[PDB]
Write a protein that holds these residues in place. Sequence first.
Motif, short mmCIF file in Angstrom:
data_model
loop_
_atom_site.label_atom_id
_atom_site.label_comp_id
_atom_site.label_asym_id
_atom_site.label_seq_id
_atom_site.Cartn_x
_atom_site.Cartn_y
_atom_site.Cartn_z
N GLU A 52 0.83 -1.21 0.00
CA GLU A 52 0.00 0.00 0.00
C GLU A 52 0.87 1.27 0.00
OE1 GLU A 52 -3.27 0.07 -0.26
OE2 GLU A 52 -2.68 -2.02 -0.62
N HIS A 53 1.95 1.23 0.79
CA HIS A 53 2.94 2.33 0.75
C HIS A 53 3.38 2.67 -0.66
CE1 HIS A 53 6.97 3.98 0.47
NE2 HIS A 53 6.53 4.72 1.46
N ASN A 54 3.83 1.68 -1.43
CA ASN A 54 4.49 1.84 -2.69
C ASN A 54 3.45 2.29 -3.71
OD1 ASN A 54 6.86 1.02 -1.49
ND2 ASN A 54 6.85 -1.04 -2.36
N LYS A 82 0.66 4.12 -2.90
CA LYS A 82 0.28 5.51 -2.59
C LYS A 82 1.40 6.47 -3.03
CE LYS A 82 -3.00 5.08 1.04
NZ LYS A 82 -3.10 6.05 2.16
N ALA A 83 2.64 6.01 -2.93
CA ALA A 83 3.79 6.87 -3.20
C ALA A 83 4.00 7.01 -4.69
CB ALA A 83 5.02 6.31 -2.49
N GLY A 84 3.45 6.09 -5.48
CA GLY A 84 3.61 6.15 -6.93
C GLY A 84 4.91 5.51 -7.38
N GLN A 118 17.50 5.81 2.84
CA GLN A 118 16.55 5.49 1.76
C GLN A 118 15.22 6.14 2.06
OE1 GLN A 118 16.94 5.38 -1.24
NE2 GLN A 118 17.49 3.31 -1.53
N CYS A 119 14.64 5.75 3.18
CA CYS A 119 13.24 6.07 3.48
C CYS A 119 13.02 7.55 3.80
CB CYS A 119 12.77 5.30 4.73
SG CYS A 119 13.08 3.51 4.65
N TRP A 120 13.85 8.04 4.72
CA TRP A 120 13.64 9.44 5.17
C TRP A 120 14.20 10.39 4.15
CZ3 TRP A 120 16.10 10.68 10.60
CH2 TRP A 120 15.95 12.04 10.88
N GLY A 121 15.22 10.00 3.39
CA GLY A 121 15.72 10.64 2.20
C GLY A 121 14.75 10.87 1.05
N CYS A 122 13.99 9.82 0.62
CA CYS A 122 12.96 10.09 -0.36
C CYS A 122 11.88 11.02 0.17
CB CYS A 122 12.27 8.81 -0.86
SG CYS A 122 10.96 9.20 -2.03
N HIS A 123 11.50 10.89 1.45
CA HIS A 123 10.38 11.72 1.94
C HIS A 123 10.80 13.20 1.92
CE1 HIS A 123 8.84 8.09 4.51
NE2 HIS A 123 8.51 8.00 3.25
N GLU A 124 12.06 13.39 2.27
CA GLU A 124 12.58 14.76 2.27
C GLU A 124 12.74 15.33 0.87
OE1 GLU A 124 16.30 17.08 3.60
OE2 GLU A 124 15.76 15.38 4.98
N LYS A 125 13.25 14.49 -0.03
CA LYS A 125 13.32 14.89 -1.43
C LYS A 125 11.98 15.15 -2.06
CE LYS A 125 13.83 12.77 -5.91
NZ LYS A 125 12.65 13.20 -6.72
N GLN A 126 10.89 14.46 -1.73
CA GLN A 126 9.63 14.73 -2.37
C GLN A 126 8.79 15.68 -1.55
OE1 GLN A 126 7.94 11.07 -3.85
NE2 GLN A 126 9.93 10.62 -4.83
N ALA A 127 9.22 15.96 -0.34
CA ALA A 127 8.41 16.81 0.54
C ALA A 127 7.10 16.13 0.89
CB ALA A 127 8.15 18.16 -0.11
N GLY A 144 5.50 12.44 3.18
CA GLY A 144 5.89 11.26 4.00
C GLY A 144 6.39 11.78 5.34
N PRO A 145 6.50 10.90 6.31
CA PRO A 145 6.91 11.22 7.66
C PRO A 145 8.36 11.71 7.67
CG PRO A 145 6.69 8.86 7.44
CD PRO A 145 6.29 9.46 6.11
N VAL A 146 8.66 12.65 8.57
CA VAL A 146 10.05 13.06 8.74
C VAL A 146 10.38 13.25 10.22
CG1 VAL A 146 10.66 13.91 6.43
CG2 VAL A 146 9.33 15.41 7.97
C1 HEM Z 1 11.64 2.83 3.79
C2 HEM Z 1 11.44 1.47 4.08
C3 HEM Z 1 10.37 3.68 3.98
C4 HEM Z 1 9.56 3.79 5.02
C5 HEM Z 1 9.65 3.16 6.43
C6 HEM Z 1 8.46 4.66 4.64
C7 HEM Z 1 7.39 4.99 5.43
C8 HEM Z 1 6.36 5.85 5.11
C9 HEM Z 1 5.18 6.11 5.91
C10 HEM Z 1 4.92 5.46 7.28
C11 HEM Z 1 4.41 6.93 5.21
C12 HEM Z 1 3.07 7.59 5.65
C13 HEM Z 1 1.90 6.66 5.29
C14 HEM Z 1 0.56 7.22 5.77
O1 HEM Z 1 -0.05 7.96 4.96
O2 HEM Z 1 0.21 6.92 6.94
C15 HEM Z 1 5.05 7.19 3.94
C16 HEM Z 1 4.56 7.97 2.92
C17 HEM Z 1 5.27 8.28 1.75
N1 HEM Z 1 6.43 7.67 1.29
FE1 HEM Z 1 7.53 6.44 2.38
N2 HEM Z 1 8.71 5.16 3.38
C18 HEM Z 1 9.84 4.52 2.93
C19 HEM Z 1 10.46 4.78 1.72
C20 HEM Z 1 9.97 5.65 0.77
C21 HEM Z 1 10.69 5.97 -0.47
C22 HEM Z 1 12.04 5.32 -0.87
C23 HEM Z 1 9.92 6.80 -1.16
C24 HEM Z 1 10.29 7.54 -2.48
C25 HEM Z 1 11.00 6.81 -3.42
C26 HEM Z 1 8.78 7.14 -0.31
C27 HEM Z 1 7.79 7.99 -0.73
C28 HEM Z 1 6.70 8.22 0.05
C29 HEM Z 1 5.58 9.07 -0.34
C30 HEM Z 1 5.59 9.94 -1.63
C31 HEM Z 1 4.76 9.12 0.69
C32 HEM Z 1 3.44 9.92 0.88
C33 HEM Z 1 2.21 9.20 0.28
C34 HEM Z 1 1.02 10.15 0.22
O3 HEM Z 1 0.41 10.31 1.27
O4 HEM Z 1 0.83 10.78 -0.84
N3 HEM Z 1 8.86 6.42 0.88
N4 HEM Z 1 6.24 6.49 3.87
#
Ligand code: HEM
Length: 103
Positions: free
Chosen positions: A26-28, A30-32, A81-90, A92-94
């Motif tokens: 579901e993560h992957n 939603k993230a596209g 990986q994880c916190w890096g993509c979230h920061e780059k896309q603005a 996701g959790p930080v």
């Molecule tokens: C690495 C394993 C990783 C983790 C852990 C992770 C977690 C995470 C959470 C818990 C969320 C929030 C989900 C919710 O809505 O409750 C979240 C959301 C986003 N992520 Fe993430 N994420 C991990 C990795 C990655 C990577 C490598 C990417 C980008 C390549 C990425 C991207 C995103 C995106 C975009 C979202 C937001 C989705 C939305 O609400 O539109 N994450 N992630």
Amino acid sequence: XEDMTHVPTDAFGKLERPAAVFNHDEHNEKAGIESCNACHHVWVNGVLAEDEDSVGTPCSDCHALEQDGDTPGLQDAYHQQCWGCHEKQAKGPVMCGECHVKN
Ligand code: HEM
Ligand code: HEM
Ligand code: HEM
Ligand code: HEM
Ligand SMILES: [As]
Ligand SMILES: [As]
Ligand SMILES: [As]
Ligand SMILES: [Zn+2]
Ligand SMILES: [Zn+2]
Ligand SMILES: [Zn+2]
Ligand SMILES: [Zn+2]
């Protein structure tokens, strides 16, 4: 990993923090993220294969707990990986407590 709801933690031994929330499929969706090697990457001789992936090999098979050279230790691999993509896309959790959720 369609049953996955947190990142696997058995490689770490005693945890300081809650397991990180991660409903993989579901993560992957939603993230596209359309490529599996966005995470399941294949790095060989300093070069990242763009057309391959390491699906089926745990991160912890290549990433020890300690840094080795420029291969990140396992905690840092996940944070970069994880916190890096979230920061780059603005997106996701930080904060620590938005992945490592106390519940
Ligand atoms: C690495 C394993 C990783 C983790 C852990 C992770 C977690 C995470 C959470 C818990 C969320 C929030 C989900 C919710 O809505 O409750 C979240 C959301 C986003 N992520 Fe993430 N994420 C991990 C990795 C990655 C990577 C490598 C990417 C980008 C390549 C990425 C991207 C995103 C995106 C975009 C979202 C937001 C989705 C939305 O609400 O539109 N994450 N992630
Ligand atoms: C692309 C569609 C993709 C596939 C396919 C895939 C598969 C995969 C499997 C089969 C596992 C192992 C599950 C198990 O042990 O039962 C697994 C594990 C993890 N994945 Fe994955 N994965 C795909 C893509 C993505 C992407 C884009 C990310 C990062 C956002 C991601 C990450 C993870 C993580 C973290 C794990 C756990 C690793 C471990 O140590 O077992 N995957 N995935
Ligand atoms: C499992 C999903 C997994 C994670 C998480 C992960 C993270 C990761 C990071 C963030 C880096 C730093 C460089 C970059 O951002 O890509 C990195 C580096 C390398 N990795 Fe990795 N990695 C995961 C999976 C795996 C697997 C299964 C292998 C072994 C087949 C592997 C190998 C490596 C290597 C080697 C490096 C260093 C690359 C270089 O700088 O030479 N990773 N990892
Ligand atoms: C905030 C700065 C923060 C801290 C502190 C933190 C800690 C941390 C530790 C100590 C580990 C190692 C395992 C343990 O509990 O001892 C670890 C592992 C992972 N982290 Fe983390 N982390 C913080 C921030 C974040 C955020 C924002 C994310 C989600 C994007 C996240 C993710 C992960 C992942 C994935 C791992 C490995 C799997 C697991 O331990 O849950 N961290 N973190
Ligand atoms: As689905
Ligand atoms: As950062
Ligand atoms: As920055
Ligand atoms: Zn949970
Ligand atoms: Zn769907
Ligand atoms: Zn593949
Ligand atoms: Zn930063």
